[PDB]
Amino acid sequence: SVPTPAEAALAAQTALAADDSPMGDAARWAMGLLTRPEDVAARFIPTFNFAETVREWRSKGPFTVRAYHPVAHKGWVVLSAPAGVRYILSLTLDSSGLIRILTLKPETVIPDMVTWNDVEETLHTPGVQHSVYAVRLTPDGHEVLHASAPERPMPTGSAYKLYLMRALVAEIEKGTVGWDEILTLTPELRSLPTGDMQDLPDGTRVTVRETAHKMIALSDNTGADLVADRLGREVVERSLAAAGHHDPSLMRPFLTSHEVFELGWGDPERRAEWVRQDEAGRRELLEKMAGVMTVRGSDLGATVHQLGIDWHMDAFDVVRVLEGLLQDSGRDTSGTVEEILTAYPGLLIDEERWRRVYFKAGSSPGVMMFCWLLQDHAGISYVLVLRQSADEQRLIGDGLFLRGIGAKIIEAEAKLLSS
C-alpha cells in the first residue's frame, strides 16, 4: 500500500504547512519567496545580490511541492515546475533557525535500488573515483555485503572528526580531560563553516561535551579545532592506530580544519612548500601558519586533497572507527557519547527498524563521503561507507547524489543489507 504520486505530493504539501519546527519555518518562508532586504536580513545568519537570485529562481516556476525532507538543521524540498522539470530547494540552518545556505538546483535523480549492481551503475561517473563498502558486524567478524575499492585510501573530509571523537573518549577514560571542562573560543581558534561555533564571540566558554556534540552533529569545524587544540596534535596522532586507522602516516601531520582551509586556499607558495616537505618540515610550516585565518569561504574551489591537504583513510578505517565508537558508547554508562553520536542521523530514519544510527559526512573540493552505522532492535549492526573523489568539484556536486544513494540503500535495507 505504497502512496501513489498524487498522495505523496499532497502528504508533502501538508507536512510542509504543518511542520512546527525551525526547518518548517524556514522552508515555508523560502517557498514564499518562490510563490524586502530587512526581512531577508532577519531570516539569514548575521554575516550573510539575493533579490536578483530570487528573481531568477521565480522565473523558473510556478512550482509545486512534490516531496519534503526535513532532517534537523538540513532540509530538502523537491519541486516540479512547468513541463515536468524538477528542482530541489536545499536549506541549511544555524543553531537558532537562521538560514545559512539556501539553494535551488536541478533535481538529483536516484532510482529505487534492487541490487548492489544498481548502486554501482547509478554512482559511476567518469573522472570520479568511488567506493561503496557495506558490512554486517558480528561477534565472529565482519560479513561483507558489498565492496568496491574499500582498500583504496581516499580523502574523507570531516570523517576525521570520528577519529578526533575516539581520541577524546580515550582521554576522558584516562582522566586527562573531563566532559564538563571549559574550552574557550579565541580569534586564532575560529574556523569556517560547516558549523555554528565560529559565530560565537571571542572568549566564549563552552564545555567539552557541548563542543564535541557540535563537532559531530553539525560537523562543526570550530568545535573540532577546539577539541584538537585541547588534546594536542601529538595525542591525536598517537591515538590513530588503536582508534582503527591502518596507516596513521597517511594522516600525519593530523590537520585541523583551520589548517586545511588556510593552507589549501591561502598563499600558493606556502602550499607548494608543503608539497616539497617531509613530516618534520610540514609540522614546522603549520606552526608558522598559526594565527587568525585569512582565507574565506569564497576562496574555496580548486582541489587540494591530492596534495595531502585532507584526511585520507580506507573504507576499512571508517568501519573500524564506527565500530569502535559503538564500543566506546556502550562503555560510557552516562550516555554522553551516545547522545553526541545519535543527534543527527543525516536522514529520516525508520525508528521502528533501527534502534540507533550513527552518521558522519565529509566534504571538500573534489571530496565527498557519507557513512552510517545502523543497529536494529535485536542488536544487529550494519556499516555503510560511500566515498567519491575527483580532480574537478563539478563531477561530484553538493553531495545530494551520494547522500541520496545512501538513503536509497537504507530504504532497501531488506534487499541490500539484511536479506
From the CB of 165, what's the least distance to Cl ion, in Å?
16
From the CB of 186, what's the least distance to Cl ion, in Å?
28
Residue 50, number of CB atoms within 10 A of its CB: 13
**Angle 289-217-34 (CA atoms, 0-180°, nearest 5)?**
100
When asked if residue 23 is in the footprint of Cl ion (CB under 5 A), the reply is: no
From the CB of 369, what's the least distance to Cl ion, in Å?
10
Of 92 and 239, nearer to Cl ion (C-beta) is 92
Of 23 and 34, nearer to Cl ion (C-beta) is 23
- Contact window for Cl ion (CB under 5 A) among 96-104, 172-180, 185-193, 357-365: 357-365
Of 248 and 346, nearer to Cl ion (C-beta) is 346
Q: With contacts defined by CB under 5 A, how many residues of the chain interact with Cl ion?
A: 2
- Contact window for Cl ion (CB under 5 A) among 92-100, 236-244, 276-284, 341-349: 341-349
Is cis: bond before 253, omega within 30 of 0? yes
Q: Which residue is nearest to Cl ion (CB)?
A: 361
CA distances from 367 to 130, 208, 284, 310, 339 (A): 10, 29, 27, 9, 28
In 3D space, the residue among 265, 234, 96, 260 whose CA is nearest the CA of residue 167 turns out to be 234
From the CB of 92, what's the least distance to Cl ion, in Å?
9
**Nearest-angstrom CA–CA distance, 197 and 215:** 9
Of 87 and 370, nearer to Cl ion (C-beta) is 370
From the CB of 239, what's the least distance to Cl ion, in Å?
25
CB 38 within 8 A of CB 58: no
Of 308 and 406, nearer to Cl ion (C-beta) is 406
| Interface positions, 91-130, toward Cl ion (CB under 5 A) | none
- Contact window for Cl ion (CB under 5 A) among 202-210, 280-288, 289-297, 359-367: 359-367
Residues whose CB falls within 8 Å of the CB of residue 222, separated by 6 or more in sequence, listed in order: 185, 189, 190, 191, 195, 197, 198, 257
From the CB of 97, what's the least distance to Cl ion, in Å?
17
**Nearest-angstrom CA–CA distance, 313 and 286:** 21
From the CB of 194, what's the least distance to Cl ion, in Å?
9
- Contact window for Cl ion (CB under 5 A) among 130-138, 230-238, 338-346, 347-355: 338-346
* Separation of CA 196 from chain center: 14
Of 24 and 346, nearer to Cl ion (C-beta) is 346
Binding mask 295-324 for Cl ion (x = CB under 5 A): ------------------------------
β pairing state of 154-155 and 182-184: unpaired
Of 92 and 148, nearer to Cl ion (C-beta) is 92
From the CB of 360, what's the least distance to Cl ion, in Å?
9
- Contact window for Cl ion (CB under 5 A) among 255-263, 335-343, 346-354, 410-418: 346-354
- Contact window for Cl ion (CB under 5 A) among 106-114, 229-237, 339-347, 384-392: 339-347
Q: Which three cell numbers stand for residue 400?
A: 545530494
Of 110 and 361, nearer to Cl ion (C-beta) is 361
When asked if residue 361 is in the footprint of Cl ion (CB under 5 A), the reply is: yes
From the CB of 72, what's the least distance to Cl ion, in Å?
10
Of 170 and 386, nearer to Cl ion (C-beta) is 386
From the CB of 216, what's the least distance to Cl ion, in Å?
12
When asked if residue 255 is in the footprint of Cl ion (CB under 5 A), the reply is: no
- List residues near Cl ion by CB under 5 A: 346, 361
